[PDB]
Amino acid sequence: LRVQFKRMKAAEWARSDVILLESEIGFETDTGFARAGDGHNRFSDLGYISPLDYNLLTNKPNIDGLATKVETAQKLQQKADKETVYTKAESKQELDKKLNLKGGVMTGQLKFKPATGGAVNIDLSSTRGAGVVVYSDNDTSDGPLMSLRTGKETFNQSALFVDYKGTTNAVNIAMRQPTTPNFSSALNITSGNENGSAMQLRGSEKALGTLKITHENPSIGADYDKNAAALSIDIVKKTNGAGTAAQGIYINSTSGTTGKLLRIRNLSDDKFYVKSDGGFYAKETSQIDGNLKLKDPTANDHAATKAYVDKAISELKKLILK
Amino acid sequence: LRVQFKRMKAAEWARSDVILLESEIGFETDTGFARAGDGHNRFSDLGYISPLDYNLLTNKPNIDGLATKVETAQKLQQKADKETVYTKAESKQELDKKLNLKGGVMTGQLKFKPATGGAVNIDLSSTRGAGVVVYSDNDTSDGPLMSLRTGKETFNQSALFVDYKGTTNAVNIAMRQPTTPNFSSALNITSGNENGSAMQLRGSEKALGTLKITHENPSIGADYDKNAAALSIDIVKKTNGAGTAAQGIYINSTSGTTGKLLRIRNLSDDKFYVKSDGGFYAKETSQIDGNLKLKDPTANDHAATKAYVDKAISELKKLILK
Amino acid sequence: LRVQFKRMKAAEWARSDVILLESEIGFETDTGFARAGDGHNRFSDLGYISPLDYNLLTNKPNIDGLATKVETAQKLQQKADKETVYTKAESKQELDKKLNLKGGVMTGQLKFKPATGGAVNIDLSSTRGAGVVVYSDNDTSDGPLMSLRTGKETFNQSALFVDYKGTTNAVNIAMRQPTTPNFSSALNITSGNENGSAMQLRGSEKALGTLKITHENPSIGADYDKNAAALSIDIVKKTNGAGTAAQGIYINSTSGTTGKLLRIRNLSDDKFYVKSDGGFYAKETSQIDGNLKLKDPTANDHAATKAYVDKAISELKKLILK
Ligand code: NA
Ligand code: NA
Ligand code: NA
Ligand code: NA
Ligand code: NA
Ligand code: NA
């Protein structure tokens, strides 16, 4: 036997009314596939003669090891997008533009506009360095090293307040000798306030002056500084004013002193002084371009008055002539 | 021939002892599947009549193109989690709160507590702007523009040290004329140290005063300032003290000067002076409410003493009366 | 009928010349698989008797739900790599090292080297706190609280400029009383410039002194301060110099004053003064260790000259003797 089976093309079968017997095979001539009858169904309703169920295959791929689109998308949701985060390089670029608390170099202006005190507060209690150090070795400039300004007439605090305990000078100003001399001063002060002293000084020295001024000859030449003075006072009118009545020096002691009010010495020898009572001493021959009004003499070394002379002359006259 | 095959349900086959001949087909009536005998195996041990091996399929999916869960997880491991990284927007928010080295506006206190010197160091050698600029146009305040304070009696440095070379004033203080006059000063200094001068000044002028004081009439009225002075000195006791012996002005020259020790002028004309030797000159008639003790006259314009008069009178008496 | 089919091993078939009739089945004895003839093809060119097309399977896996390697890689490309981005913890570590505009504590030096003015600009117009507060409660130190230095002789601005409107002192320096007295001053000023006054002061007081100096006894003892003065002046030569000709005090009024040029009081009583014309008054008995050159007396209380005496004596002599 070489058995052949009922057979036609797959399309021909699908329209055929031929009913295969139970187990009887029919063959699709253009596909090479067989189906077996159940004794009632037409051929298009028969199944193939061997399984076509993925579950039944051998050598299946490892499907359960493969990622799903859903699970992948869920995980990617937790990850940061490149676009919306800075790289370390970018972060470093940004951070390098900002000041370290450790210290740094500012290249632009630091402004304070406020929202122990101070906008700037420097506590040196634990260190041996300076607080604020400003310097310029520039030839010239358009601004001072430091400027303090108040703008309202009511302003009720100082521009600069120095509260000092210590063993050296609270404030020291040194104007160094220039290569060539110029018109400048170490300290210049002006006030246009008529109801307060431009400068006030108070001290409580045991054996020194409250203000001590020394003039030192800038030259070795004995009379180079013949026009200099330790203290120089000028008393002037207002521009376009009619004059002035201001005094030069005024000395008082509101509680009463027993000291000399003015004492002038040279080589530490008293040369001229005004005692606490107003009497004076002068060490050498002196001159008044005028008269001197004084009391009649009582001691031999007292200056005689005109009245004393005239009386002596009159008495002698009366005595001689009888 | 319509051939039919040995056949029963799949479950019936699996328990059957029927041995199919080699190539003989048996059919599962409930599944439609066939298996062919090997001449010895029972039906449950026979394979189906067509392959069920995934490898042999046509139109296979592209498995090798699909991502594995393992490879995906390995790659995701290298990616940054959203939760643990700042967005650019967040980074910007944080950076904007920090000071740029370029410059910026502080709104709170900058404190220095330290771990060429200075906690703050400003070098203006290459620029033409100011160093530290403090100002207030506030009506009033509870603090000074600038405050320097030292707290220990041993402190061995100054609060403020000015070391100045230049062509203008090292320190300039201007107290501007107020709308209406008040009791304030441009500079006020107090010291309670008994062993040092409250203020010390030293200069080496060729032809100027070490201290120069000018009083200017605040008015055009010729005697408006009749009660003013360029220098005013007061000499007072301690509160609850018994008195004072302090001197007013003390002048000396420890090395010896040939200059006038006090020289008083008006309109640049000498009116009264004390020479380096202590002799004085006064330009006009003067008054002592007391006697004047001096030497016997030798020149015609010398004041005569009582002794000189008395002797002249005595000699004349002796001469007349024989 | 138990039908058996032409059959041999799969390898034997692949070399066989046997041509199966159309639909005739041949069996591979070692594989259990059948193929059916087309009436012309050799067995290796026949297809199996049931489909082997993946598309036709039932129970297929959800391939379209599985992620591809390509799509996964494309998505991962948009995600940030851990290595190249800082964590929040790292960002915080870096930010905490930088200064907040709100305020902060510097622990290192803040330098300004510059690329209303000031490297540091403080505007207190809207607040009641201080600007710059420097202090030290250290026992000692190697630097001042504040230092201002200029290095070139041409420098044309001040180290410190105070421009002040207000109701209190522009600058106040208080040297507090030390536990034990020492050699220090509240303000020390030196200048080596020969062409400018070390210090210049100008004021326009109505009824006060431009400079006011008070000395206060540091003790309750009436003569404790017997060696003190409100003002002390010294006039010295240069080291290795030949001497000095500098004056002590120089007073002038370049426009002409009608005030007393020097007025010395005690307990607010005039004791000695030099009038605007140079005549003086002294309240008590005085002494010159020398002669006094003056004018011939015209009033009874004028000091007599030697010439006046000698003339009176001569006239009396001529009168008596005829
Ligand atoms: Na005395
Ligand atoms: Na002496
Ligand atoms: Na001289
Ligand atoms: Na003149
Ligand atoms: Na007058
Ligand atoms: Na009085």
The verdict on a CB contact (< 8 Å) between C206 and B109 is: no
Distance (angstroms) between ligand 5 centre and the Cα of A200 equals 26
DSSP string of B239-288, one letter each residue: TT---B--EEEEEE-SS-B-S-SEEEEETTEEEEEE-TTS-EEESS-EEE
Q: What is the dihedral of CA B102, B104, B106, B111, to 10 degrees?
A: 10
Task: Name the minimum distance, in Å, from the CA of B17 to any CA of chain A.
Answer: 20
Gap between the Cα atoms of A53 and A38, Å rounded: 20
As separate numbers, helices (DSSP H) first and strands (DSSP E) second, chain C gives: 4, 20
Give the C-alpha distances (Å, rounded to integers) separating A124 from A62, A128, A311, B108.
74, 7, 82, 20
d(CA B134, CA A119): 10
CB C142 to CB B157 under 8 A? yes
Residue B182 annotated as binding site: no
First and final C-alpha spacing in chain B: 215
Listed in order, strand segments (DSSP E) in chain B are 6-8, 25-28, 34-36, 104-106, 110-112, 120-123, 132-136, 146-150, 160-164, 171-175, 187-191, 199-203, 209-216, 229-236, 247-252, 262-266, 269-274, 280-282, 286-288, 292-293
Angstrom CA distances, C159 to A134, B5, B7, C149, stand at 9, 122, 120, 7
- Segment holding C309, helix H or strand E: helix C306-321
Q: How many CB atoms lie within 10 A of CB C53?
A: 11
Contacts of A303 in chain C (CB under 8 A): 292, 303-304
**Partners of B138 in the β-ladder:** none
* Residue (of B249, B272, B276, B271) closest to B260 by Cα position: B276
- The enclosing H or E element of C77 equals helix C69-77
- Which single residue is written with the structure tokens 């800075």? A86
A256: left (phi over 0), alpha (psi -120 to 50) or beta: left
Count of B–C CB contacts within 8 Å?
A: 822
CB within 8 A of C127, min separation 6: which ones? Answer: A114, B138, B141
Q: Return the structure tokens found at B197.
A: 């001068």
Chain B within 8 Å of A127 (Cβ-Cβ)?
yes
Instruction: Determine the Cα–Cα distance for residues C274 and A250; give it in Å rounded to an integer.
Output: 11
d(CA B303, CA C296): 9
Chain B contact present for A264, CB below 8 A: yes
Q: Which of A238, C140, C303 is nearest to B288 (CA)?
A: C303
The closest alpha carbon to A265, from A253, A254, A273, belongs to A273
Q: Is B121 annotated as a binding residue?
A: no
A71 is in an annotated binding site: no
Residue type, C154: T
The domain segmentation of chain C, as residue ranges, is: 1-322
Chain C nearest-CA residue for B52: C52
Check CB contact of A73 with chain B, cutoff 8 Å.
Answer: no
- Helix, strand or coil for residue C317? helix
